[PDB]
Amino acid sequence: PAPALRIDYPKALQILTEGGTHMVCTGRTHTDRLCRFKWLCYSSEAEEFIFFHGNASVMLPSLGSRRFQPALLDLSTVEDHNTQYFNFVELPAAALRFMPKPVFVPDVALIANRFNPDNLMHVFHDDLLPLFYTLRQFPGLAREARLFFMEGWGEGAHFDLYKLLSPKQPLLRAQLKALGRLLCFSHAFVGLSKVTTWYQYGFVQPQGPKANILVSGNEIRQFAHFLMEKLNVSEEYILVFSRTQNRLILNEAELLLALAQEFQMKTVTVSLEDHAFADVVRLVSNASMLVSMHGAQLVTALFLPRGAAVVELFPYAVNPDHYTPYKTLATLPGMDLQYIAWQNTMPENTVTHPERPWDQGGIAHLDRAEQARILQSREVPRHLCCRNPEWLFRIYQDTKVDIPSLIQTIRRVVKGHPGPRKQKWTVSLYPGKVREARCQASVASEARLSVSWQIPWNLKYLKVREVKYEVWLQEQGENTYVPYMLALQNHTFTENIKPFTTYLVWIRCIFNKTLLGPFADVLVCST
Amino acid sequence: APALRYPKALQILTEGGTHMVCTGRTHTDRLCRFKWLCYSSEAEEFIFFHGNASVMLPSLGSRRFQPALLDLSTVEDHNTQYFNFVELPAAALRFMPKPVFVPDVALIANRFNPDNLMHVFHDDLLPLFYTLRQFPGLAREARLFFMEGWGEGAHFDLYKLLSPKQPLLRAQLKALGRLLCFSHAFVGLSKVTTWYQYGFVQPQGPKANILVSGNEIRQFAHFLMEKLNVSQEEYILVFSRTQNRLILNEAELLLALAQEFQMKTVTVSLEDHAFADVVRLVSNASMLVSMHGAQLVTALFLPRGAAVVELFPYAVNPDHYTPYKTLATLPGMDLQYIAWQNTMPENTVTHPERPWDQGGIAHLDRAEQARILQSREVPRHLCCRNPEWLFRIYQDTKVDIPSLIQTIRRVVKGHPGPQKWTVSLYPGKVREARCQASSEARLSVSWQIPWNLKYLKVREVKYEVWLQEQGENTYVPYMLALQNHTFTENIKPFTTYLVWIRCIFNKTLLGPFADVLVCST
Ligand SMILES: O=c1ccn([C@@H]2O[C@H](COP(=O)(O)OP(=O)(O)O)[C@@H](O)[C@H]2O)c(=O)[nH]1
Ligand SMILES: O=c1ccn([C@@H]2O[C@H](COP(=O)(O)OP(=O)(O)O)[C@@H](O)[C@H]2O)c(=O)[nH]1
Ligand SMILES: *[C@@H]1O[C@H](CO)[C@@H](O)[C@H](O)[C@H]1NC(C)=O
Ligand SMILES: *[C@@H]1O[C@H](CO)[C@@H](O)[C@H](O)[C@H]1NC(C)=O
Ligand SMILES: *[C@@H]1O[C@H](CO)[C@@H](O)[C@H](O)[C@H]1NC(C)=O
Ligand SMILES: *[C@@H]1O[C@H](CO)[C@@H](O)[C@H](O)[C@H]1NC(C)=O
Ligand SMILES: *[C@@H]1O[C@H](CO)[C@@H](O)[C@H](O)[C@H]1NC(C)=O
Ligand SMILES: *[C@@H]1O[C@H](CO)[C@@H](O)[C@H](O)[C@H]1NC(C)=O
Ligand SMILES: *[C@@H]1O[C@H](CO)[C@@H](O)[C@H](O)[C@H]1NC(C)=O
Ligand SMILES: *[C@H]1O[C@H](CO)[C@@H](O)[C@H](O)[C@@H]1O
């Protein structure tokens, strides 16, 4: 039994009225900024956060007019999206005399914007994963924070997933007008980290993977482990993730039997509509292979066990290489998932729906000349977000899957039985710097350059399959080097080494060809 | 407990491994929160242990060495102040000594130059103060770990005021144990409070985009004053040096200042006064006069409205060396700044026989010595030990009184020192921006005042309007006093115009643009 401590109202009102708002934020740009506020206020009538200047006020960063070029920070994880900015208006703390008495929020708050709470992929990629690790950026937040979703949408189809990310009930912006005309957070954090994102949806360039992905499969799976425990989720089979409303697999029944016979495994169907989400996660987490049309439901592939296979199907005229949010997820370093893409290339096996509304892929609202152009094109061109008619027209086709071509496409990657072979998922880490690098000239001989060094310190405690040392030889005063790949820690160079010459020697250790370590301090050596 | 050599801790470490979550896009603005980060005192390497609960955000791959994970000092991208770790599986602890655990939460950072007062305040104290306040619980509980490798330095007592717990230096970790393991540690310092760069790539000068204002400097100074028991008759304060860079006619300077401003004058120095007494003297000075030097960083303790008079030796252009000019003229600092330069060779004293440390030139080739002696202004240069710069900056100076008084009087007319201080805030967006269309084309626009202006009294309120024709990448600007306008000049029918509106307080406080107003004629 813990005390249900409320706010000490006279004390809080005095600290607010005399001291004012306090703000300390990270990062130097608005696209990578997280803010810690004390005594930040919000008027539910104006729908504006308020910074009150008092005698203890702090504003870091202090941007001046730059606070509106474009704003203070991104409230959502979609970078620089001009409808998801956060900012406040300023008033002197004395101006509280002209306002109703404030209502204080005792809970520590995390304020953020959900991008599209109706799409499972946006929920996981833009909100759930960023929230999970943003909370763990600051001590105490993970156990105490109440989420405040200010984007303006309702609960959405997946609100129960948002409730798993916090012990307290999250609040929407529309609910704040009932709490009071002037609300003041005693302790609030604002913003979401972009560190877990891997996709951009096509606002400035055609959609695709983020340029520099900073998340690995291990961090994805730690998040999945948490959600599975929250959902109370603790005969090998193939799982077909079905859709019931649009973008259908028209011969799903034939597909289930064909996969069952080809791989000699039980096949099972799952869908968002007919299964509770905890049951969906339960089925995915033990599946050896996940087969599904391109769509939001494939984001659940992050729950797949290591070693499982993802088979993504694409409708006619949809190039798999151009739409890769689930390919990128499946092939992240550390995810350890096989990825297979299959595209319908037979026009007799596709079903178009030109009469539907525009948001469902219809084209009847366009002029007859443009409809014929869309109908005659056999691949969606590269485009920008969000309502490209040809993209929607083709992505909401129904598909008859050519069974033998799908089987052969899978077999080029899954040569035998699918799923984990109970493999040893070794950790992949990098060497340290080589230590104590020394060098010597000849001991009337040729020109000789002999170099030696000690192994990296962490290699003292490592068992590694292949250890090599890349050595760069740069002659004094020249801008070019000669590379060497060596296995030993002691080498004497002779070929093309000149007498009475000084060389710059750079050394770095490499594990298994691809894991490059850092270079040590440069070694200067004369022959 | 400061140290501990708990089976729960060893098992959490051996099973789960290290946990890392960091902010920032690049290594130059990254702060990291670590759990179970470890350090080998023998190898002087931090260690990330890969366990079954390990997290590495960001996961940089090989890019973790281009050039490192983060900056350990607030000097940007300095190739000797990098932080990084080496990796091992958590099971490798079988072949390592029994770890000694640091139970207190830690903040790990590098001091750039703990022997220079300016470097102490600018690079370390201010960044430490606000980095601790970036994360809950740090300001009251953190133990500071300085890893740059220096000793205490002359100002180590100032670092102790930022923390109730005893700080530890890297050389002191060796005695703690061969393998040290932090249960909770933060790494890095924010650069948000910095305002100067010391000339590593381009010549030294102000930071390109300064993100700190005088209000944040003064909140930090207020905290330090209470830690020094400095509580809260007008006088002018001359901040003298006793070893080098002397004012040769100091006694006559004190008399001439006291007569010119009809005000008491008093001296102070770092050598002859306890630092708490130095702060007490500066905090009520109406004017601070001193040679260019580290002691002028104490100007951040001056009361609002006081004047800073910085004197420069012969051949030292004040415009090239502006760390204290930048500090004094920061927005919100409310300090007047005056620079005076000695331009008479008969009033300067050189010391060519001193070590390189103190500006001697006797260790150089005779041809280089002749160049330095014959040059009348120190050229622009990069860090760190330029001989001509050190030779002139350690000159002694006889201050020409009539020229200095005239220089001060161009900035300080009348009495120096403190006035009422309004904080300058910005307008909100204009609200409910509507428009009407019209022949000859006509376009009417109107809007409501920003919400915060409902509660403000402002001397001058104007509205800037950008008129952009849809399909053109340019605009026509207008400055209005009313909340409405009707455009007729160069307005066309069958055209779509985009209207951008922002409000401006007192000419210079530009507010944000509202959402674009699309009006078609
Ligand atoms: O037959 C369907 C079609 C869609 N959805 C879900 O409804 C949301 C919106 O679907 P949409 O097609 O707009 O998103 P997409 O799948 O193209 O990302 C997503 O969470 C889908 O998984 C569903 O459950 N069944
Ligand atoms: O006569 C002197 C000369 C220097 N210093 C202090 O000693 C440190 C190192 O001086 P240096 O000249 O290297 O720094 P500078 O003043 O040029 O920044 C600084 O904290 C100075 O304030 C001092 O107290 N008295
Ligand atoms: C602000 O006001 C409080 C209450 O009077 C006072 O204790 C404090 O010294 C003032 N100044 C600052 C910088 O907090
Ligand atoms: C799922 O089934 C059982 C546990 O329910 C487990 O033995 C099996 O390995 C799991 N599937 C995979 C692919 O690991
Ligand atoms: C190889 O061994 C050591 C390096 O550890 C070095 O002293 C020795 O001279 C090397 N051999 C040569 C340079 O022939
Ligand atoms: C890690 O190991 C602990 C103890 O062995 C166990 O409780 C936990 O489930 C494992 N997995 C994760 C993801 O922590
Ligand atoms: C100020 O006095 C208090 C004792 O109550 C203490 O914080 C500290 O030792 C003193 N500081 C100085 C500089 O005298
Ligand atoms: C502090 O400074 C004020 C401002 O000029 C002045 O009254 C005097 O120098 C000091 N007052 C004290 C110590 O009470
Ligand atoms: C235009 O704005 C002024 C104040 O700026 C106001 O007095 C006037 O009534 C407004 N006119 C219209 C037509 O709204
Ligand atoms: C809006 O646009 C996004 C990005 O293309 C889609 O993922 C979403 O389904 C909706 O079409």
UniProtKB/Swiss-Prot annotation, chain B:
Alphabetized InterPro entries for the sequence:
FN3_dom, FN3_sf, Glyco_transf_61_cat, Glycosyltransferase_61, Ig-like_fold
Enumerate the catalysed reactions.
Answer: 3-O-(alpha-D-mannosyl)-L-threonyl-[protein] + UDP-N-acetyl-alpha-D-glucosamine = 3-O-(N-acetyl-beta-D-glucosaminyl-(1->4)-alpha-D-mannosyl)-L-threonyl-[protein] + UDP + H(+)
GO biological process entries: neuron migration; protein O-linked glycosylation; protein O-linked mannosylation
Task: Please state the pathway this protein functions in, per its UniProt record.
Answer: Protein modification; protein glycosylation
Coiled-coil ranges from the UniProt annotation? none
The catalytic activity of this protein is classed by the Enzyme Commission as 2.4.1.312
Instruction: Write down the glycosylated positions.
Output: N52, N229
Into which EC class is this enzyme placed?
Answer: transferase
What GO terms fall under cellular component here? endoplasmic reticulum; endoplasmic reticulum membrane
Query: PROSITE patterns recorded for this chain?
Result: FN3
For membrane topology, the record states:
Single-pass type II membrane protein
Q: Which residues form the Fibronectin type-III domain?
A: 433-521
For this UniProt record, the keywords arranged alphabetically read as follows:
Endoplasmic reticulum, Glycoprotein, Glycosyltransferase, Membrane, Signal-anchor, Transferase, Transmembrane, Transmembrane helix
Subcellular localization is given as: Endoplasmic reticulum membrane
Give the Pfam families listed for this entry. Answer: Glyco_transf_61 (PF04577)
The residues exposed to the Lumenal compartment are 1-521
Superkingdom of the source?
Answer: Eukaryota
Q: What molecular function terms (GO) are annotated for this protein?
A: acetylglucosaminyltransferase activity; protein O-acetylglucosaminyltransferase activity
Q: Which family does it belong to?
A: Belongs to the glycosyltransferase 61 family.
Q: What does this protein do?
A: O-linked mannose beta-1,4-N-acetylglucosaminyltransferase that transfers UDP-N-acetyl-D-glucosamine to the 4-position of the mannose to generate N-acetyl-D-glucosamine-beta-1,4-O-D-mannosylprotein. Involved in the biosynthesis of the phosphorylated O-mannosyl trisaccharide (N-acetylgalactosamine-beta-3-N-acetylglucosamine-beta-4-(phosphate-6-)mannose), a carbohydrate structure present in alpha-dystroglycan (DAG1), which is required for binding laminin G-like domain-containing extracellular proteins with high affinity.
Designated name of the protein: Protein O-linked-mannose beta-1,4-N-acetylglucosaminyltransferase 2
Q: What is the lineage of its organism?
A: Eukaryota, Metazoa, Chordata, Craniata, Vertebrata
